[PDB]
Amino acid sequence: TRFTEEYQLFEELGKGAFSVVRRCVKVLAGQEYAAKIINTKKLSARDHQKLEREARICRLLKHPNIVRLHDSISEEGHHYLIFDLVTGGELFEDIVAREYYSEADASHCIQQILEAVLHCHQMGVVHRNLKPENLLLASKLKGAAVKLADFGLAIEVEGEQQAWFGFAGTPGYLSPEVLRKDPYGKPVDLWACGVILYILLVGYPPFWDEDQHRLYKQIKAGAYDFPSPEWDTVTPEAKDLINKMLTINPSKRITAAEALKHPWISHR
């Protein structure tokens, strides 16, 4: 098919199961991209589903804080996902290696996360798997933009209509509604944003236990706090936002729009 003839393959960029990604060049255009090479038939029945989903849903999102898919392509026993090239790594690498972010830079960070997420919800897409590992930095530059990635677990919703889309995502960042087989929708992303914002500011998550059972219990209960000392110097509006995001009833939980208006993110 098209990939072999249009795209020239370069260095090894990253790995992830039966899918090596490489820097590639659309030769005629000259422009360079990240091309996710994926083994076909080494993959499972469910994996091909999550691939169509990824392809379809990414080919829906035009935003500077969402990694753009430029071309989904299938050939002999290999599928090709062509993305915006990004060399700033995961937001996880950067948090880990900087302990935490200042309020200034945490606000600047979750702002971009909130706008990406809002475009997502405007095109009726819910991501269900926001986390520092699934957020990428444009380049190694200071100030480099934050680009939302990995839509393998993303789902399309119809208007503001809620439903059981299955138990899917990541133990730490999962919403209470999901933990209670409740019909869920747009708001599960905000819960996830809350968790990220807490991490951002102190460098650890609000909910965590060595026993999944106890982790899901405290998540379900909204059982987080803002410990001393670290949390003592932190503006009470920053905390406010996190309450409004880690609100436990998704009805009265804050939206992506409401949040981008909040004084902790807006005046910035």
């Binding site: 469910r46 999550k50 996880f92 948090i95 880990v96 798997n129 986390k131 520092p132 590992e133 699934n134 990995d150 393998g152 677990l153 299955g166 138990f167 899917a168 995502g169 990541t170 133990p171 730490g172 960042y173 991490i199 460098g203 650890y204 998550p205 609000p206 909910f207 965590w208 999944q212 410990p227």
Partner: peptide
Amino acid sequence: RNKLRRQHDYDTFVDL
């Protein structure tokens, strides 16, 4: 405090 380590994405309820 609690720990920031990396976590993986599940497609189903896998009780750990």
